[PDB]
Design an enzyme around this catalytic site. Structure first.
Site, mmCIF file in Angstrom:
data_model
loop_
_atom_site.group_PDB
_atom_site.id
_atom_site.type_symbol
_atom_site.label_atom_id
_atom_site.label_comp_id
_atom_site.label_asym_id
_atom_site.label_seq_id
_atom_site.Cartn_x
_atom_site.Cartn_y
_atom_site.Cartn_z
ATOM 1 N N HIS A 81 51.101 36.842 39.790
ATOM 2 C CA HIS A 81 51.088 35.434 39.002
ATOM 3 C C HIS A 81 52.722 34.956 38.941
ATOM 4 C CE1 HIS A 81 47.132 36.485 37.475
ATOM 5 N NE2 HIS A 81 47.186 35.276 37.498
ATOM 6 N N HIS A 85 52.364 31.752 43.767
ATOM 7 C CA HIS A 85 51.379 31.430 43.241
ATOM 8 C C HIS A 85 50.784 29.915 42.640
ATOM 9 C CE1 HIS A 85 47.211 31.390 41.154
ATOM 10 N NE2 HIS A 85 47.902 31.133 39.999
ATOM 11 N N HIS A 121 50.444 26.086 35.214
ATOM 12 C CA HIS A 121 49.423 26.631 34.353
ATOM 13 C C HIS A 121 49.355 28.244 34.351
ATOM 14 C CE1 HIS A 121 48.074 28.302 38.357
ATOM 15 N NE2 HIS A 121 47.224 29.076 37.728
ATOM 16 N N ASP A 122 50.426 28.879 34.769
ATOM 17 C CA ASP A 122 50.549 30.396 34.555
ATOM 18 C C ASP A 122 51.945 30.772 34.287
ATOM 19 O OD1 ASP A 122 48.328 31.851 35.136
ATOM 20 O OD2 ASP A 122 48.203 31.495 37.259
ATOM 21 N N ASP A 233 43.257 27.177 41.431
ATOM 22 C CA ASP A 233 43.388 28.603 40.943
ATOM 23 C C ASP A 233 42.864 29.611 41.941
ATOM 24 O OD1 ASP A 233 44.832 30.206 39.280
ATOM 25 O OD2 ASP A 233 43.712 29.671 37.507
HETATM 26 C C1 LIG Z 1 41.620 37.705 43.872
HETATM 27 C C2 LIG Z 1 41.211 37.778 42.724
HETATM 28 N N1 LIG Z 1 40.520 38.789 42.096
HETATM 29 C C3 LIG Z 1 39.776 38.631 40.951
HETATM 30 C C4 LIG Z 1 39.166 39.974 40.392
HETATM 31 C C5 LIG Z 1 38.747 39.795 39.051
HETATM 32 C C6 LIG Z 1 39.036 38.965 38.520
HETATM 33 C C7 LIG Z 1 38.525 38.704 36.852
HETATM 34 O O1 LIG Z 1 38.998 38.414 36.049
HETATM 35 N N2 LIG Z 1 37.065 39.293 36.776
HETATM 36 C C8 LIG Z 1 36.402 39.389 35.507
HETATM 37 C C9 LIG Z 1 36.363 40.716 35.041
HETATM 38 C C10 LIG Z 1 35.927 40.389 33.531
HETATM 39 C C11 LIG Z 1 35.662 41.648 35.693
HETATM 40 C C12 LIG Z 1 39.700 37.750 38.686
HETATM 41 C C13 LIG Z 1 40.012 37.928 39.977
HETATM 42 N N3 LIG Z 1 40.809 36.803 40.357
HETATM 43 C C14 LIG Z 1 41.306 35.545 39.822
HETATM 44 C C15 LIG Z 1 41.387 34.864 38.540
HETATM 45 C C16 LIG Z 1 40.194 34.278 38.279
HETATM 46 C C17 LIG Z 1 40.111 33.524 37.180
HETATM 47 O O2 LIG Z 1 38.871 32.902 36.527
HETATM 48 C C18 LIG Z 1 39.007 31.210 36.864
HETATM 49 C C19 LIG Z 1 39.244 30.887 35.291
HETATM 50 C C20 LIG Z 1 37.729 31.047 37.336
HETATM 51 C C21 LIG Z 1 40.327 31.234 37.396
HETATM 52 C C22 LIG Z 1 41.135 33.525 36.097
HETATM 53 C C23 LIG Z 1 42.346 34.351 36.484
HETATM 54 C C24 LIG Z 1 42.427 34.964 37.709
HETATM 55 CL CL1 LIG Z 1 43.796 35.971 38.101
HETATM 56 N N4 LIG Z 1 42.133 34.885 40.788
HETATM 57 N N5 LIG Z 1 42.068 35.576 42.045
HETATM 58 C C25 LIG Z 1 41.397 36.837 41.862
HETATM 59 MG MG LIG Z 2 46.155 32.072 34.473
HETATM 60 ZN ZN LIG Z 3 46.675 30.777 38.242
#
Ligand SMILES: Cc1nc2ccc(C(=O)NCC(C)C)cc2n2c(-c3cc(OC(C)(C)C)ccc3Cl)nnc12
Ligand SMILES: [Mg+2]
Ligand SMILES: [Zn+2]
Length: 342
Positions: A81, A85, A121-122, A233
């Site tokens: 972050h 990003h 946003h971050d 995102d």
């Molecule tokens: C590469 C990559 N791996 C991720 C692996 C797991 C998760 C996670 O939180 N899993 C849920 C838990 C409860 C098990 C998110 C991941 N992630 C995101 C991300 C997605 C987001 O969700 C929205 C709102 C749709 C943007 C918000 C913020 C972030 Cl940083 N961005 N890249 C990633």
């Molecule tokens: Mg964020």
């Molecule tokens: Zn972000």
């Protein structure tokens, strides 16, 4: 002061053509993380100009230059972050503008708000999630935990703090109503990056895609902005394998550092945050299935030309499936030693 020197050139040297940044800068195949970080501020300005926002909203260039550098300077450097990003997220917003004809769906001011929201946003992310805020009783939790979306409220407040910094308010000539509108949009769009928020509106995003987008429906405009924001995102998943592999390294570095801090506080980390328990291929596959792929499937449903994006994400997922066997050590380690067993 470095920023003053950077500012001086950013302002007086002039906004370079987007095609000079890269021949394919406006292509879905372009990887914006390939751009040297020292060039990203100029590229932000180039994108703003190419989308005609500078002209249309008569943005003061000294103010815009200060604003862009302030936003860049407002990111810290955790592994994921960070400013690169926010820049790659903003770049994807630009791609959607160039490739998907957003002006048929959204108002001028809404598309502008989306791009600015992507930059901000971050803001000031500390490499930890909302739950960690509460658990560690952070200042940010003291402010916002009763409301939820602790980090996202902070990101939005930081954007406003930057606008309220003298010489940085790129909107301060706006009419009262347009000013009000822009800030309200930034609120809703930045708050949409909380996964809790996405999960809560997902059925509505589905119904919207089912019945068909109605440009005369104000709720449809709001839902679409949320979907677009979340697709920006996650846009690292829409490039090649190397990008999705790299971003896995970055985000798990960041996750595991959080988990290490949680263990030190005597608490049990989420599995995906626990370097002793987390099995990256499975976690990444799950994130793609449950989070990334349905967002791009929704985007494809609403925008036929977004089909390649969904297909690229699904492909990258299958590549994770193909390399998963490499996380099992066959033969000996490449140092011929079983010392790691002790
Ligand atoms: C590469 C990559 N791996 C991720 C692996 C797991 C998760 C996670 O939180 N899993 C849920 C838990 C409860 C098990 C998110 C991941 N992630 C995101 C991300 C997605 C987001 O969700 C929205 C709102 C749709 C943007 C918000 C913020 C972030 Cl940083 N961005 N890249 C990633
Ligand atoms: Mg964020
Ligand atoms: Zn972000």
């Amino acid at each position: 002061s470095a920023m003053d020197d950077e500012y001086t050139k950013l302002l007086h040297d002039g906004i370079q053509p987007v095609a000079a940044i890269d021949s394919n800068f406006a292509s879905f195949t372009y990887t914006p993380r390939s751009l040297p970080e020292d060039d990203t501020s100029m590229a932000i300005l180039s994108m703003l100009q190419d989308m005609n926002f500078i002209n249309n909203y008569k943005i003061d260039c000294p103010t815009l230059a200060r604003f862009c550098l302030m936003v860049k300077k407002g990111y810290r450097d955790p592994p994921y972050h960070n400013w690169m990003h926010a820049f790659s997220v903003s770049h994807f917003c630009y791609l959607l503008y160039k490739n998907l004809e957003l002006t048929n769906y959204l108002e001028d001011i809404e598309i502008f708000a989306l791009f600015i929201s992507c930059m901000c946003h971050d803001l000031d992310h500390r490499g930890t999630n909302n739950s960690f805020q509460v658990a560690s009783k952070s200042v940010l939790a003291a402010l916002y935990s009763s409301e939820g979306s602790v980090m996202e409220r902070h990101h939005f407040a930081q954007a406003i703090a930057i606008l309220n910094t003298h010489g940085c308010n790129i909107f301060d000539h706006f009419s009262r109503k347009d000013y009000q509108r822009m800030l309200d949009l930034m609120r809703d769009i930045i708050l949409a990056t909380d996964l809790a928020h996405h999960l809560r509106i997902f059925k509505d995003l589905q119904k919207m895609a089912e019945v068909g987008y109605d440009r005369n429906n104000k709720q449809h405009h709001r839902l679409l902005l949320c979907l677009l924001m979340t697709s920006c995102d996650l846009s690292d998943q829409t490039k090649g394998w190397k990008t999705t592999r790299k971003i896995a390294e970055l985000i798990y570095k960041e996750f595991f550092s959080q988990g290490d801090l949680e263990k030190a506080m005597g608490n049990r980390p989420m599995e995906m945050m626990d370097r002793e328990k987390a099995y990256i291929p499975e976690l990444q596959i799950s994130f793609m299935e449950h989070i990334a792929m349905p967002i791009y499937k929704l985007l494809q449903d609403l925008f036929p030309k977004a089909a390649e994006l969904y297909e690229r994400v699904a492909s990258n997922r299958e590549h994770w499936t193909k390399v998963s066997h490499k996380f099992t050590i066959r033969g000996l380690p490449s140092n011929n030693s079983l010392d790691f067993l002790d």
